[PDB]
Design a protein around this nucleic acid. Structure first.
Ligand SMILES: Nc1ccn([C@@H]2O[C@H](COP(=O)(O)CP(=O)(O)OP(=O)(O)O)[C@@H](O)[C@H]2O)c(=O)n1
Ligand SMILES: [Mg+2]
Ligand SMILES: [Zn+2]
Ligand SMILES: [Zn+2]
Ligand SMILES: [Zn+2]
Lengths: 45, 50, 50, 58, 64, 1123
RNA sequence: UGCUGACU
DNA sequence: GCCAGAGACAGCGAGTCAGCAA
DNA sequence: CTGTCCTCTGGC
């Protein structure tokens, strides 16, 4: 369930191995990975 | 703290510890604590007439 | 839009109303913390269109 | 940053406005003797051009 | 970008006077009277609000 | 106009406005007029100039078999960018937002329709696809044209952008205005290296730079020979050819030799050396064999036929016309006009030779013009189109020379055979910057033509579209005379804005009011109007003596001889037409009238330029009050007051718009530049372009290399009003700080500065860097099976929890050296490679763009990862004020050890008061008081230069402001010592000043090497910082270290640390090459003499063995005596 | 190696 | 044989950091 | 862009 948001459509595309990297509902060629809930620790200094 | 737009989310846990304002200003308890010596003003002569 | 490190900074400079005299200093390397030395707060907010 | 006294400024012409400087580390124990005796920074008090002092307060 | 939480010179907290400042300026008050009505006495605090440029409102305009 | 609605004093109530974030209805219009010369030039180059370029394009006739074929290009058309072929879906358009995400060129399609004929009765029009030409951003052939700021935000663009640049591989090349000599104007020059051109040449000559319709340029030199004769030098394809004049004059005009003579002696009809030397030009080389126009054309044709590469079936008379059309006076269509222009350039060499005229300095802007992006683009397009024709017909002639009758079947298969050319040649000129051309385009420079436009700040970016480079060759010159800042660049180039090192005086910048001309007009009714005004045509009846008459020129074409008592009135009438927009005189024609006296002043005459590349600048035309535009040469003969009360009755023909018109856009952002010394305003201009600020609003989209961002910028409380005309608060650059000018620490001396520690811990000047790395994984492989897919084989112990199943770090994860960074998977074999993170700095991944192949068919091979690196002010970082006072941060002084004031305050910057006495930056002492008064009264004062006189001082004004707030006039408040607690005896000068943070940090400039890599030719440290790399000791250091008498420190440094080997030698032969090992008791045996008892090891450098080897290479022998 | 920026 | 004509010809501060294209 | 070479060339 690796999601990628389109560049201007903003549709969640899930891509894999061996498949092209175009976007559904459009045809753009740039897609940003999505932020999942993972724990990271930062210091307030 | 922040500003959000639809679909944007913040989710975090903050831990607060004890400390003095010497190792970081965030732990300092006063805006300012300065002092000033009391001024002294003396009229050596009677000032008058505008 | 606010970064993670900048959010952590902004959160450090927020004053808490706990009185520090009822607490104690976390021992060096006490990452976990206990009722004696730490206070935990949670911010969980999401923006939606009404 | 490599911190240096201000009496040694005029000797190098350093100005603390972004002034990268190199530091070499002798490795022989026979170049250390010469860095101590000859190249030391107090044998360098007078400029060799006219013998007038080089180190001073500013 | 966003209002600093504490004034840099004296750590007075000015991060809660942004919306109040904007509201007193919409009511017709000068920046001087407005900064006075908020409790910002020393000019180190007054510069913290007087010269703030809210660029979080221009970044919060490009797509999600 | 266009400078009205300029703010009278700056304001602060625009921030804190209820409409701050609402994108506006139309773009700003003052920011738009900055890149206007870059866009309006390209708009012509690509639509109206391309037709003209292809119109010249002589039809390329050549021989096939026993046939002659003609190919002409009827039209060429460049199309906006678009998805390649239809193989893609849902949007034909292609917006510059991508090709920055992906790394690609914004390129449009160039296609022409050629027309091939066989003798002119058999013909067919084929439409070939030439190639791809890059496109500017808002250039009429781009998809972001006509978009309001709100629609420009839904495509990921700046909402305030003015493109004027190209995106070549997503890098935004910014081709900048180079300086050319002039166009269509004869410049008389005295260059002593000219007498080496031949046996009797002198150091005199008029040069002309000819440009036709912005597609062709050529340089022709008329030289004076000592005999009184004049020669003509022309260059064709980078070869210089010398033709005596007379051969040229007789060819161009079918006139008698007396009529040619009566023309070259027009103003000096009493001189007798001239009358005699004109005849020696007409008779000595032309009555020698050729006396009719055709015989001259025939002789000239035979000598030059070989190097003009003309068609073999061309008569010699036709090959002569080819030379005159393509090499001499490109600008003029007629041959009669070309004659009159060559005659005025000669009449001028005779005056320079007889010392009746002053040499024109080629380095004065009077005799200079700019080369815009459209002139370079078309002049390359035209040349490449001609080259394409030549190559297609090379292929044609070379294939078969076979019965074209049926060969009309593969004619298109033939033209396409060489139509595969025009694309990559064009990208080289843009990606690399250097020019590969058979003719250098009449340019004189072949590198640095296009440069990277970097958005470190919006003051670095805005200065790339106002830069003017004198030339890249002048960076290598003993004499410094093209670096002189002459008084003729008043209002056209900024005095202060020049790089302050190796590029000084060579890279200048335009003032704010200056502008390049880019419009093209008819200029056909002008020659007929000049005659109504009083001019008499070149044909005759001047009505005076040819010496009491001015030679009128209009864009290279000599209209001719306005009388001497009618020249002033004519110039004034023409100036009134351009000002009031009457007749059809372009609003920007330069009516120049260089008067004539008996003195050796510049050659007299009424010129009238209207060409599309001159610099102009507005000035309030007095006596009409109508905002005229004057040029660099027209400004030398007119008085232009600056302030009123400087205007007089007879004097002061014109007046300047604003008093600070002379200064650049950046130099207008420096506060109170009038009270600082000038070398400090030159450093401020160069330091405002290295500042960490707010560079842009569109992150997540740029995918640059480095991008420095300041977290919480503020707007200066004291700033010039021009800062508010071009809203520069959309992009702030620094922060206001409470500075005290006190000597308190011992760590703030000699240019170093102190920063309070609590201010630094409360967010003062925090920042970040965005490192975007484009991982295209077509590397690590060649054209085989896809070894490239980001991916993790399941369960790899190497990427247990650092990657997320697509071999890409998590968005938000922290990266450290040695951490997993990506994992490819060779699909066929089925093997993964973790590729670890090797930077020795901590960052957080903030976005990852997955990119396709431009046809939406790519296969997970290319990605772009953006890391975020927090760069807060450490010790060793460089800060600066707006007055050239740069200094490193030496301490972070505790907040309880700082000297507190009687008001409770505590400075956050400590600035040693000893930088003022020698640097004389009195503008900082005024900015402190102005900013303190602003912060106190809630105001916003302006620091515009030249607004505060001696009578109304700035210190008086701001001290009254302060004293009106309860503080003291002179700006000094008295502090206490935060260490002893006592009120210091001196009262300190404290205030609010605007600090910028510079991009140079100790974190980027620190190196330590112990042992590591080595150059393998010499076996010495490698020599870089990104690679480990050693620092070079140097010959100066080697010569200063053996003045100490320390021979063993030298031995250590140069020998035991860099290179030290044990090369062994044959002791008897004394040769290092001779000892050779054996085949395994491994005994080196000398080859030259077979003994092994003679070999002995010697400790010798490695570069010495390399030296002995490279000497042997030359047969030289180094015989060395071992002891 | 080259070339375009930049630092003292 | 006496000394102009040249016409080659060689020299042109030290160190440092990047990016980009070939 | 300068000053010596310095190797012709050329004329005398
Ligand atoms: N190209 C260069 C430029 C600089 N340097 C070296 O850097 C020093 C300071 O440069 P500088 O330009 O700061 C002169 P300074 O007297 O310190 O300036 P001030 O009047 O503003 O105080 C020079 O004296 C040289 O030793 C160099 O070797 N090559
Ligand atoms: Mg320095
Ligand atoms: Zn989509
Ligand atoms: Zn404060
Ligand atoms: Zn031997």
């Amino acid at each position: 369930p690796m999601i990628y948001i389109c560049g201007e459509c903003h549709t969640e595309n899930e891509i894999k191995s061996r498949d092209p990297i175009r976007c559904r509902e459009c045809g753009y060629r740039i897609m940003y990975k999505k932020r999942t809930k993972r724990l990271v620790v930062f210091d307030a200094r | 703290i922040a500003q959000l737009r639809p679909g944007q989310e913040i989710d975090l846990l903050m831990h607060c510890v004890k400390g003095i304002g010497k190792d970081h200003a965030k732990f300092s308890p006063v805006a300012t604590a300065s002092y000033r010596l009391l001024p002294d003003i003396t009229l050596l002569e009677p000032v008058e007439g505008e | 839009i606010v970064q993670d490190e900048i959010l952590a900074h902004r959160l450090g400079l927020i004053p808490i109303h706990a009185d520090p005299r009822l607490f104690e200093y976390r021992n060096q390397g006490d990452e976990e913390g206990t009722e004696i030395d730490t206070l935990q707060f949670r911010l969980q907010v999401r923006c939606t269109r009404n | 940053v490599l911190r240096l006294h201000y009496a040694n400024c005029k000797a190098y012409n350093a100005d603390f406005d972004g002034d990268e400087m190199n530091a070499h580390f002798p490795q022989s124990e026979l170049g250390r003797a010469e860095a101590y005796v000859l190249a030391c920074t107090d044998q360098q008090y007078l400029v060799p051009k006219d013998g007038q002092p080089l180190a001073g307060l500013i | 970008m966003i209002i600093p939480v504490r004034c840099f010179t004296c750590g007075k907290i000015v991060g809660n006077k942004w919306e109040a400042y904007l509201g007193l300026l919409q009511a017709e008050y000068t920046e001087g009277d407005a900064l006075d009505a908020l409790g910002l006495k020393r000019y180190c605090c007054r510069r913290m609000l007087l010269a703030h440029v809210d660029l979080i409102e221009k970044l919060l305009n490009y797509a999600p | 106009s266009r400078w009205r609605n300029l703010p009278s004093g700056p304001s602060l109530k625009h921030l804190t406005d209820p409409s701050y974030g609402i994108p506006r209805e139309q773009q700003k219009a003052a920011l738009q007029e900055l890149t206007r010369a870059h866009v309006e030039s390209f708009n012509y180059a690509v639509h109206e100039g391309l037709g003209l370029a292809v119109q010249a394009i002589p039809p390329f006739e050549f021989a096939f078999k026993d046939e002659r074929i003609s190919f002409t290009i009827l039209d060429a058309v460049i199309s906006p960018p678009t998805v390649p072929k239809g193989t893609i879906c849902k949007e034909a358009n292609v917006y510059p937002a991508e090709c920055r995400g992906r790394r690609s060129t914004y390129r449009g399609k160039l296609t022409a329709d050629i027309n091939w004929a066989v003798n002119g009765i058999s013909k067919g029009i084929i439409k070939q696809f030439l190639g791809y030409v890059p496109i500017m951003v808002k250039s009429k052939l781009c998809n972001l044209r006509n978009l309001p700021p709100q629609a420009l935000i839904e495509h990921h663009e700046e909402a305030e952008e003015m493109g004027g640049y190209f995106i070549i591989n997503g890098i935004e090349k910014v081709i900048r205005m180079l300086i050319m000599p002039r166009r269509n104007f004869p410049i008389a020059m005295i260059r002593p290296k000219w007498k080496t051109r031949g046996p009797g040449y002198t150091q005199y000559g008029v040069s002309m730079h000819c440009v036709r319709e912005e597609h062709s340029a050529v340089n022709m030199n008329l030289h004076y020979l000592e005999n009184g004769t004049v020669m003509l030098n022309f260059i064709y394809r980078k070869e210089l050819f010398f033709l005596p004049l007379g051969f040229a004059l007789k060819a161009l005009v079918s006139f008698s030799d007396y009529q040619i003579f009566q023309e070259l002696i027009k103003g000096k009809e009493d001189d007798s050396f001239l009358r005699n030397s004109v005849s020696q030009m007409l008779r000595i080389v032309m009555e020698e064999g050729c006396s009719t126009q055709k015989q001259v054309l025939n002789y000239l044709g035979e000598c030059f036929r070989v190097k003009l590469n003309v068609p073999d079936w061309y008569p010699n008379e036709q090959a002569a016309e080819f030379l005159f059309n393509q090499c001499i006076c490109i600008h003029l269509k007629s041959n009669t006009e070309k004659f009159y222009m060559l005659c005025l350039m000669t009449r001028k060499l005779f005056a320079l030779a007889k010392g009746e005229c002053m040499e024109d300095n080629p380095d004065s802007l009077v005799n200079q013009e700019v080369l815009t992006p459209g002139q370079l683009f078309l002049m390359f397009l035209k040349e490449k189109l001609e080259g394409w024709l030549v190559s297609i017909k090379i292929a044609f002639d070379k294939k078969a020379q076979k019965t074209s009758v049926s060969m009309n079947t593969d004619n298109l298969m033939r033209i396409f055979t060489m139509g595969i050319d025009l694309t990559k040649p064009f990208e080289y000129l843009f990606a690399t910057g250097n020019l590969r051309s058979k003719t250098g385009l009449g340019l004189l420079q072949d590198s640095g033509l296009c440069v990277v436009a970097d958005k470190l700040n919006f003051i670095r970016y805005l200065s790339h579209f106002r830069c003017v480079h004198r030339g890249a060759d002048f960076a290598k010159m003993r004499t410094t005379t093209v670096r002189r800042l002459l008084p003729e660049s008043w209002g056209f180039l900024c005095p202060v804005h020049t790089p302050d090192g190796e590029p000084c005086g060579l890279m200048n910048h335009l003032t704010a009011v200056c502008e390049v001309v880019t419009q093209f007009v008819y200029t056909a009714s002008i020659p007929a109007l000049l005659c109504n005004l009083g001019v008499t045509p070149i044909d005759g009846a001047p009505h005076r003596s040819y010496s009491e008459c001015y030679p009128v020129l209009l864009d290279g074409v000599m209209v001719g001889w306005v009388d001497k008592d009618l020249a002033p009135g004519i110039a004034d009438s023409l100036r009134h037409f351009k000002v009031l927009r009457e007749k059809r005189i372009p609003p920007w024609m330069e009516v120049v009238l260089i008067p004539m006296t008996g003195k050796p002043s510049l050659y007299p005459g009424l010129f009238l330029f209207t060409t599309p590349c001159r610099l102009v600048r507005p000035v309030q035309n007095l006596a009409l009050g109508k905002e005229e535009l004057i040029g660099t040469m027209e400004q030398i003969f007119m008085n232009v007051a600056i302030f009123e009360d400087e205007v007089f009755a007879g004097v002061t023909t014109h007046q300047e718009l604003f008093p600070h018109s002379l200064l650049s856009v950046i130099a207008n952002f420096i506060p109170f530049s009038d009270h600082n010394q000038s070398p400090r305003n030159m450093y401020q201009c160069q330091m405002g372009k290295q500042t960490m600020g707010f560079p842009l609003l569109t992150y997540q989209d740029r995918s640059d290399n480095k991008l420095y961002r300041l977290q919480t910028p503020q707007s200066p409380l004291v700033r010039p009003s021009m800062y508010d005309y071009y809203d520069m608060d959309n992009y702030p650059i620094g922060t206001n700080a409470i500075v005290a000018v006190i000597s308190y620490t011992g760590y703030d001396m000699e240019d170093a500065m102190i920063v309070n520690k609590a201010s630094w811990e409360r967010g003062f000047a925090h920042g970040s860097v965005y490192k975007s790395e484009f991982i295209d994984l077509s590397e690590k492989i060649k054209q085989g099976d896809s070894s490239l897919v980001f991916g993790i084989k399941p369960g790899d112990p190497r990427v247990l929890q650092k990657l997320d199943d697509d071999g890409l770090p998590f968005i938000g994860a922290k990266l450290q050296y040695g951490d997993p960074y990506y994992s490819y998977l060779n699909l066929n074999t089925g093997e993964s490679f973790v590729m670890y993170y090797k930077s020795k700095e901590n960052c957080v991944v903030d976005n990852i763009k997955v990119c396709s192949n431009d046809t939406g068919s790519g296969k997970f091979k290319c990605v772009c990862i953006t890391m975020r690196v927090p760069r807060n002010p450490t010790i060793g970082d460089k800060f600066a004020s707006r007055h050239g006072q740069k200094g490193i941060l030496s301490r972070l002084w505790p907040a309880e050890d700082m000297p507190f004031t009687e008001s409770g305050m505590v400075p956050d910057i400590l600035f040693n008061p000893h930088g003022f006495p020698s640097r004389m930056t009195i503008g900082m002492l005024i900015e402190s008081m102005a900013g303190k008064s602003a912060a106190l009264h809630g105001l916003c004062h302006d620091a515009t230069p030249f607004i505060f006189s001696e009578e109304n001082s700035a210190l008086e004004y701001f001290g009254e402001m302060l004293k009106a707030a309860g503080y003291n006039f002179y700006g000094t408040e008295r502090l206490y010592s935060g260490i002893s607690g006592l009120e210091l005896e001196a009262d300190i000068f404290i205030g609010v000043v605007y600090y910028q943070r510079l991009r140079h940090m100790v974190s980027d400039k620190f190196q330590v090497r112990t042992t590591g890599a080595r150059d393998r030719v010499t076996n010495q440290p490698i020599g870089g910082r990104n690679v480990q790399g050693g620092i070079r000791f140097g010959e100066m250091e080697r010569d200063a270290l053996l003045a100490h008498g320390t021979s063993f420190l030298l031995h250590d440094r140069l020998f035991n640390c860099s290179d030290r080997s044990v090369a062994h030698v044959c002791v008897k032969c004394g040769s290092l090459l001779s000892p050779l090992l054996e085949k395994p008791n491994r005994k080196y045996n000398c080859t030259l003499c077979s003994r092994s008892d003679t070999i002995d090891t010697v400790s010798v450098p490695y570069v010495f063995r390399y030296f002995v080897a490279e000497l042997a290479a030359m047969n030289i022998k180094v015989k060395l005596d071992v002891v």
